[PDB]
Write a protein that binds this DNA or RNA. Structure first.
Ligand SMILES: [Ca+2]
Ligand SMILES: [Ca+2]
Ligand SMILES: [Ca+2]
Length: 84
DNA sequence: CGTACGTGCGTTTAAGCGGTGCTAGAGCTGTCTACGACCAATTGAGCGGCCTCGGCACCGGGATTGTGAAAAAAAAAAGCTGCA
């Protein structure tokens, strides 16, 4: 149930998080360097991507390991695929 | 392969120039004497000589440190799958 909401740069983080085959790795600057393939505002992109993550983390759908700016490490987790 | 650099635009900035006006201070002049050259006589600090004995160079033996191979683990990465 509940309210599903619209994200944008959010999408492009989760696209780019899965578009690396790894165990616990995705530092904001690695992500940005891939995803700077553009329609995007490259000048203001990092803040919005940085802003974007915190909320993904707070939902816990995206999962990370010990830090904040220092760690730069997370991936998609929980358990979501098409299912009953 | 990702981007830090070079290129070339238009916009902005202050260097450059020529000039005027003020005075700090560079430098020049003459005077006067404190201070350094020079001298000779005086004597002790430091030279060469020479003698010694203890630090230090060299050795052997025992302790310790670090390297490297070999065996075996932990992991990372590769090649291999069907699905969706
Ligand atoms: Ca580079
Ligand atoms: Ca003067
Ligand atoms: Ca001597």
């Amino acid at each position: 149930k509940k309210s599903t909401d619209h994200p944008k740069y959010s999408d492009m983080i989760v696209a780019a998080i899965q578009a690396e085959k790894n165990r616990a790795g995705s530092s904001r600057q690695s992500i940005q360097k891939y995803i700077k393939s553009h329609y995007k505002v490259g000048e203001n992109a990092d803040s919005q991507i940085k802003l974007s993550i915190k909320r993904l983390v707070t939902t816990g759908v995206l999962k990370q390991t010990k830090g904040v700016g220092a760690s730069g490490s997370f991936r998609l987790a929980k358990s979501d695929e098409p299912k009953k």
